[PDB]
Amino acid sequence: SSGENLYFQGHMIDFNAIKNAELLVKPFKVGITTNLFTDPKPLFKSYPNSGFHNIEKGTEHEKQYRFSVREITTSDLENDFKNLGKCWQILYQEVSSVQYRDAILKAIDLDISGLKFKMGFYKYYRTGDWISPHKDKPEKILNHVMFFNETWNCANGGQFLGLRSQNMDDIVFEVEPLVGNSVFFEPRENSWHAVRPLLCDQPRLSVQIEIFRTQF
Protein backbone atom coordinates (compact mmCIF):
# COMPACT_ATOMS: atom_id res chain seq x y z
CA SER A 1 0.00 0.00 0.00
CA SER A 2 1.19 3.48 -0.85
CA GLY A 3 1.65 6.25 1.66
CA GLU A 4 -1.10 8.65 2.78
CA ASN A 5 0.51 11.73 1.22
CA LEU A 6 0.77 13.86 -1.94
CA TYR A 7 2.86 13.10 -5.00
CA PHE A 8 4.35 15.62 -7.40
CA GLN A 9 2.95 15.87 -10.93
CA GLY A 10 3.94 19.17 -12.48
CA HIS A 11 2.25 18.76 -15.89
CA MET A 12 0.63 16.24 -18.23
CA ILE A 13 3.98 16.09 -20.06
CA ASP A 14 7.19 15.19 -18.28
CA PHE A 15 9.34 17.90 -19.89
CA ASN A 16 12.43 16.20 -18.55
CA ALA A 17 11.59 13.26 -20.82
CA ILE A 18 12.03 15.64 -23.77
CA LYS A 19 15.19 17.35 -22.41
CA ASN A 20 16.73 13.95 -21.70
CA ALA A 21 15.38 12.06 -24.72
CA GLU A 22 17.47 9.53 -26.55
CA LEU A 23 19.05 11.69 -29.24
CA LEU A 24 20.36 10.39 -32.53
CA VAL A 25 22.46 12.53 -34.84
CA LYS A 26 22.87 9.86 -37.59
CA PRO A 27 21.09 8.87 -39.85
CA PHE A 28 19.46 12.23 -39.03
CA LYS A 29 18.91 14.27 -35.87
CA VAL A 30 15.91 12.84 -34.03
CA GLY A 31 14.82 12.57 -30.37
CA ILE A 32 13.00 9.57 -28.97
CA THR A 33 11.23 9.72 -25.61
CA THR A 34 10.16 7.15 -23.08
CA ASN A 35 7.57 7.97 -20.39
CA LEU A 36 6.67 11.34 -21.94
CA PHE A 37 3.37 11.43 -19.97
CA THR A 38 3.18 11.61 -16.19
CA ASP A 39 -0.23 9.82 -16.02
CA PRO A 40 -0.31 7.58 -19.14
CA LYS A 41 -2.96 5.00 -18.29
CA PRO A 42 -6.20 6.96 -18.88
CA LEU A 43 -5.04 8.57 -22.14
CA PHE A 44 -5.95 5.57 -24.35
CA LYS A 45 -9.56 5.53 -23.16
CA SER A 46 -9.89 9.32 -23.56
CA TYR A 47 -8.64 9.41 -27.15
CA PRO A 48 -11.46 10.69 -29.42
CA ASN A 49 -13.62 8.07 -31.15
CA SER A 50 -15.53 10.27 -33.62
CA GLY A 51 -14.92 13.18 -35.96
CA PHE A 52 -12.31 11.44 -38.10
CA HIS A 53 -11.98 11.49 -41.88
CA ASN A 54 -10.45 8.54 -43.73
CA ILE A 55 -7.85 9.59 -46.29
CA GLU A 56 -5.60 7.73 -48.67
CA LYS A 57 -3.09 8.31 -51.42
CA GLY A 58 -1.71 5.75 -53.82
CA THR A 59 1.12 5.62 -56.34
CA GLU A 60 -0.13 8.73 -58.15
CA HIS A 61 1.12 10.78 -55.15
CA GLU A 62 4.69 11.45 -53.98
CA LYS A 63 3.94 9.45 -50.83
CA GLN A 64 1.39 6.71 -50.20
CA TYR A 65 -0.69 6.22 -47.08
CA ARG A 66 -4.02 5.10 -45.62
CA PHE A 67 -5.19 6.33 -42.20
CA SER A 68 -7.78 8.57 -40.54
CA VAL A 69 -7.34 12.05 -39.10
CA ARG A 70 -9.20 14.41 -36.77
CA GLU A 71 -7.60 17.84 -36.58
CA ILE A 72 -7.75 20.23 -33.68
CA THR A 73 -9.43 23.27 -35.20
CA THR A 74 -10.19 26.88 -34.26
CA SER A 75 -13.72 25.62 -33.50
CA ASP A 76 -12.23 23.58 -30.63
CA LEU A 77 -10.32 26.62 -29.37
CA GLU A 78 -13.47 28.74 -29.42
CA ASN A 79 -15.76 26.21 -27.70
CA ASP A 80 -13.26 25.41 -24.92
CA PHE A 81 -12.63 21.90 -26.29
CA LYS A 82 -16.13 20.80 -25.35
CA ASN A 83 -16.12 17.93 -27.92
CA LEU A 84 -12.87 16.44 -26.61
CA GLY A 85 -11.63 15.03 -23.36
CA LYS A 86 -10.12 17.57 -20.97
CA CYS A 87 -6.68 15.97 -21.32
CA TRP A 88 -6.51 17.09 -24.98
CA GLN A 89 -7.11 20.72 -23.99
CA ILE A 90 -4.27 20.35 -21.46
CA LEU A 91 -2.01 18.80 -24.10
CA TYR A 92 -2.73 21.75 -26.43
CA GLN A 93 -1.95 24.21 -23.60
CA GLU A 94 1.32 22.46 -22.78
CA VAL A 95 2.50 22.27 -26.42
CA SER A 96 1.78 25.98 -26.68
CA SER A 97 3.73 26.76 -23.46
CA VAL A 98 7.18 28.26 -22.79
CA GLN A 99 8.04 24.98 -21.07
CA TYR A 100 7.71 23.01 -24.34
CA ARG A 101 9.83 25.56 -26.19
CA ASP A 102 12.45 25.39 -23.44
CA ALA A 103 12.53 21.56 -23.47
CA ILE A 104 12.94 21.35 -27.25
CA LEU A 105 15.67 24.02 -27.19
CA LYS A 106 17.61 22.03 -24.58
CA ALA A 107 17.18 18.69 -26.32
CA ILE A 108 17.98 19.59 -29.94
CA ASP A 109 19.23 23.23 -29.91
CA LEU A 110 16.30 24.44 -32.03
CA ASP A 111 14.30 27.49 -30.89
CA ILE A 112 10.59 27.30 -31.80
CA SER A 113 9.67 30.65 -30.22
CA GLY A 114 7.21 32.59 -32.34
CA LEU A 115 6.53 29.65 -34.74
CA LYS A 116 3.07 28.28 -35.51
CA PHE A 117 1.71 24.77 -35.06
CA LYS A 118 -0.97 22.34 -36.16
CA MET A 119 -2.13 19.47 -33.94
CA GLY A 120 -4.04 16.41 -35.07
CA PHE A 121 -5.21 12.95 -34.07
CA TYR A 122 -3.86 10.34 -36.55
CA LYS A 123 -5.42 6.89 -36.15
CA TYR A 124 -4.34 3.76 -38.03
CA TYR A 125 -6.93 1.08 -37.42
CA ARG A 126 -7.52 -1.14 -40.46
CA THR A 127 -5.31 -3.81 -41.95
CA GLY A 128 -3.02 -2.08 -44.42
CA ASP A 129 -3.12 1.37 -42.82
CA TRP A 130 0.40 2.81 -43.13
CA ILE A 131 2.50 5.62 -44.53
CA SER A 132 5.28 5.05 -47.10
CA PRO A 133 8.87 6.36 -46.90
CA HIS A 134 8.87 10.15 -46.70
CA LYS A 135 10.95 12.99 -45.21
CA ASP A 136 8.06 15.28 -44.09
CA LYS A 137 7.43 18.57 -45.88
CA PRO A 138 10.38 21.03 -45.74
CA GLU A 139 7.97 23.81 -44.65
CA LYS A 140 7.85 21.93 -41.35
CA ILE A 141 10.54 23.07 -38.95
CA LEU A 142 9.78 20.33 -36.36
CA ASN A 143 7.47 17.37 -36.18
CA HIS A 144 6.59 15.63 -32.91
CA VAL A 145 4.58 12.38 -33.04
CA MET A 146 3.20 11.09 -29.71
CA PHE A 147 1.71 7.60 -29.15
CA PHE A 148 -1.11 6.61 -26.80
CA ASN A 149 -1.64 2.85 -26.86
CA GLU A 150 -1.63 1.11 -23.51
CA THR A 151 -0.76 -2.19 -25.22
CA TRP A 152 0.54 -3.06 -28.69
CA ASN A 153 1.20 -6.49 -30.16
CA CYS A 154 4.38 -5.92 -32.14
CA ALA A 155 3.40 -8.70 -34.58
CA ASN A 156 0.49 -6.37 -35.60
CA GLY A 157 2.90 -4.12 -37.57
CA GLY A 158 2.54 -0.41 -36.94
CA GLN A 159 6.09 0.43 -35.80
CA PHE A 160 7.51 3.84 -36.61
CA LEU A 161 10.47 3.12 -38.90
CA GLY A 162 13.53 5.35 -39.07
CA LEU A 163 15.09 4.73 -42.47
CA ARG A 164 18.33 5.42 -44.27
CA SER A 165 16.70 6.00 -47.66
CA GLN A 166 13.34 5.97 -49.45
CA ASN A 167 12.95 2.23 -48.93
CA MET A 168 10.79 0.39 -46.36
CA ASP A 169 13.51 -2.24 -45.89
CA ASP A 170 16.41 0.15 -45.15
CA ILE A 171 15.62 0.37 -41.44
CA VAL A 172 17.94 1.97 -38.88
CA PHE A 173 15.66 2.07 -35.82
CA GLU A 174 12.07 1.27 -34.84
CA VAL A 175 9.75 2.77 -32.23
CA GLU A 176 6.77 0.87 -30.85
CA PRO A 177 3.53 2.95 -30.67
CA LEU A 178 3.19 2.70 -26.89
CA VAL A 179 2.08 5.51 -24.60
CA GLY A 180 5.10 7.50 -23.42
CA ASN A 181 7.00 6.89 -26.64
CA SER A 182 7.32 9.77 -29.05
CA VAL A 183 9.63 10.91 -31.86
CA PHE A 184 10.60 14.47 -32.64
CA PHE A 185 12.77 15.74 -35.48
CA GLU A 186 13.41 18.55 -37.90
CA PRO A 187 12.47 17.48 -41.44
CA ARG A 188 15.60 17.45 -43.64
CA GLU A 189 16.68 16.11 -47.05
CA ASN A 190 17.39 12.70 -45.44
CA SER A 191 14.87 12.40 -42.56
CA TRP A 192 13.34 9.29 -44.09
CA HIS A 193 10.72 7.43 -42.03
CA ALA A 194 7.56 5.34 -42.47
CA VAL A 195 4.99 3.28 -40.58
CA ARG A 196 5.01 -0.47 -41.07
CA PRO A 197 1.52 -1.44 -42.39
CA LEU A 198 -1.00 -2.87 -39.93
CA LEU A 199 -1.62 -6.63 -40.27
CA CYS A 200 -4.70 -6.62 -37.96
CA ASP A 201 -7.64 -4.19 -37.45
CA GLN A 202 -6.24 -2.86 -34.18
CA PRO A 203 -6.36 0.87 -33.35
CA ARG A 204 -2.92 2.55 -33.25
CA LEU A 205 -3.50 5.99 -31.72
CA SER A 206 -1.24 9.01 -32.16
CA VAL A 207 -1.11 12.84 -32.11
CA GLN A 208 1.10 14.80 -34.47
CA ILE A 209 2.36 18.30 -33.65
CA GLU A 210 3.63 20.11 -36.76
CA ILE A 211 5.61 23.33 -36.28
CA PHE A 212 6.28 25.78 -39.10
CA ARG A 213 6.81 29.33 -40.19
CA THR A 214 5.19 29.11 -43.63
CA GLN A 215 1.73 27.63 -43.84
CA PHE A 216 1.36 24.36 -45.76
Ligand X SMILES: N[C@@H]1[C@@H](O)[C@@H](C(=O)O)O[C@@H]2[C@@H]1O[C@@H](n1ccc(=O)[nH]c1=O)[C@@H]2OP(=O)(O)O
Among 72, 136, 158, 203, binds V ion (CB under 5 A): 136
Min. distance of Cβ 67 from V ion in angstroms? 11
Min. distance of Cβ 137 from Cl ion in angstroms? 16
CB nearer to V ion: pick between 15 and 204: 204
Q: Is 98 exposed, middle or buried (0-12, 13-18, 19+ CB in 10 A)?
A: exposed
CB nearer to ligand X: pick between 55 and 199: 55
CB nearer to ligand X: pick between 15 and 47: 47
| Closest residue by beta carbon to V ion | 136
d(CA 23, CA 131): 23
Min. distance of Cβ 215 from Cl ion in angstroms? 10
For Cl ion, the binding residues (CB under 5 A) are: 213
Q: Are 155 and 90 in contact (CB under 8 A)?
A: no
CB nearer to ligand X: pick between 81 and 192: 192
